[PDB]
A paper describes a structure:
Inhibition of butyrylcholinesterase (BChE) and p38α mitogen-activated protein kinase (p38α MAPK) offers an innovative dual approach to mitigate two major drivers of neurodegeneration in AD: cholinergic deficit and neuroinflammation. Structure-based design of MTDLs that simultaneously inhibit p38α MAPK and hBChE led to the identification and subsequent optimization of the first dual inhibitors of these two AD-related target enzymes.
Compounds 94 and 95 showed balanced submicromolar inhibitory potency against hBChE and p38α MAPK, while they did not inhibit AChE at a concentration of 100 μM, which was also one of the main objectives to diminish potential side effects. Compounds 94 and 95 showed high selectivity for p38α MAPK. The KINOMEscan assay showed that off-target inhibition was limited only to structurally related kinases (p38β MAPK, JNK1/2/3, and CDK3) and was absent at 1 μM, where only p38α MAPK was inhibited among the 103 kinases tested. The 2,4-difluorobenzene sits in HR I defined by Ala51, Lys53, Leu75, Ile84, Leu104, Thr106, and Leu167. The optimal distance of 7.9 Å between the hydrogen bond donor on the indazole core (i.e., the N 2 nitrogen of the indazole) and the 2,4-difluorobenzyl group allows exquisite selectivity toward the structurally and phylogenetically most related kinases. The amide group is critical for effective inhibition of p38α MAPK as it acts as a hydrogen bond donor interacting with Asp168 of the DFG pocket (3.2 Å for compound 94 and 3.6 Å for compound 95). The tertiary amine (i.e., the dimethylamine group) faces the solvent, which explains the retention of p38α MAPK inhibition when this functional group was not present. The brain-to-serum AUC ratio was 1.58 for compound 94 and 0.83 for compound 95, indicating a higher brain penetration of compound 94.
Numbering used by the authors: 5 to 173, 186 to 353
């Protein structure tokens, strides 16, 4: 066991091993508190997240267990991974805090898009990496659910990583969630990617809606009201009525909306921003799209080992979720240096 040291940043107490030095806050919220730090054992700059009240309730305890399982499983260049997880506690009895460690990235995508407009080649490489990481995540039957510029981090090399999965198990959310459809599939993420790609090409949020209703009407204005094939798939009575009563609007021509953009980019957006989720393009299929010929390599777009999410359906006590989390802390194995 290593030796810990203690200090106060903002109003948070931080107890971490000596190897992590020069902690400086990065931000805080419901997710907990994040600090940038230097790892003397490896020489890397790292990001340390201290979970907030990890075992204060059953919802928190399960959430803590969920995040740790996910991060321990992700082993992919475009997905955030676990460098280390530790607790200052020496036993299950005193186990009360969990810290997570990962490589520090240069900036989030929301600090690039507004600082600069992106060339078509940059958009190619950035979107390509998101999809490469999404293919991996989706191969494990995991849905991110909250893909958005602030959840994508980039290095000065333009290397990208997907961060902070939505622990749910807004301008970027698929319309079937605005309609509250409880059976949305993994292509909800592909919709998010489409809204992101469009924003990089134009510099403007594609669907800057003020609420759920306003959001949907901005989406239908671009992709048009749903056809009869999609009408036949809606079970909700209120939804069906709301949609059949809206003044009908045609699908606009993306080539005209996105004038001057690479025609291969326009084509990909049209395959991503499809209202009917069954017809939306998949991450695996989008990687083979001609827009990414510069970067596509079918022997270097790997898939993930099978991920067991059976715990999601379990109804346990706080002490049981806590103990299961402790087990995952102890059995952690750092990645090969
Ligand atoms: C913006 C730069 C600091 C780039 N950067 N690089 C790595 C990294 C990790 C995090 C969060 C995080 C996740 C796993 C982990 F084990 C340790 C962690 F710290 C955050 C962050 O602060 N996320 C806040 C939550 N928001 C986005 C919803 C930011 C990160
Ligand atoms: F206006 C819309 C927008 C999106 C959808 C939709 N796309 N994929 C699945 C659905 C959907 C929505 C609600 N109920 C069932 C299915 C249906 C109508």
């Amino acid at each position: 066991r290593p030796t810990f040291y203690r200090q106060e940043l903002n109003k948070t107490i931080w107890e971490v091993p000596e190897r992590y030095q020069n902690l400086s806050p990065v931000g805080s919220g419901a997710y907990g508190s994040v600090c940038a730090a230097f790892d003397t054992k490896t020489g890397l700059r790292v990001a340390v997240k201290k979970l907030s009240r990890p075992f204060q309730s059953i919802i928190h305890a399960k959430r803590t267990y969920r995040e740790l399982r996910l991060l321990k499983h992700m082993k992919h260049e475009n997905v955030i991974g676990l460098l280390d997880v530790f607790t200052p506690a020496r036993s299950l009895e005193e186990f009360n805090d969990v810290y997570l460690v990962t490589h520090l990235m240069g900036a989030d995508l929301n600090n690039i898009v507004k600082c600069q407009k992106l060339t078509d080649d940059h958009v190619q490489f950035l979107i390509y990496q998101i999809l490469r990481g999404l293919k991996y995540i989706h191969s494990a039957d995991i849905i991110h659910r909250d893909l958005k510029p602030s959840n994508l981090a980039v290095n000065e090399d333009c290397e990208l990583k997907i961060l902070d999965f939505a622990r749910h198990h807004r301008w970027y959310r698929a319309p079937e969630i605005m309609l509250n459809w409880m059976h949305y599939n993994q292509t909800v993420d592909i919709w998010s990617v489409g809204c992101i790609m469009a924003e990089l090409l134009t510099g403007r949020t594609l669907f800057p809606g003020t609420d759920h209703i306003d959001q949907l009407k901005l989406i239908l204005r671009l992709v048009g009201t749903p056809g009869a094939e999609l009408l036949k798939k809606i079970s909700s009575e209120s939804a069906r009525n709301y949609i059949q009563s809206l003044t009908q609007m045609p699908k606009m021509n993306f080539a005209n909306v996105f004038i001057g953009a690479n025609p291969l980019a326009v084509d990909l957006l049209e395959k991503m921003l499809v209202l009917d989720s069954d017809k939306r393009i998949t991450a695996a299929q989008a990687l083979a799209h001609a827009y990414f010929a510069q970067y596509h390599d079918p022997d270097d777009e790997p898939v993930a080992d099978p991920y067991d999410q059976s715990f999601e359906s379990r109804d346990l006590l706080i002490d049981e979720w806590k103990s299961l989390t402790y087990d995952e802390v102890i059995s952690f194995v750092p990645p090969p240096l």
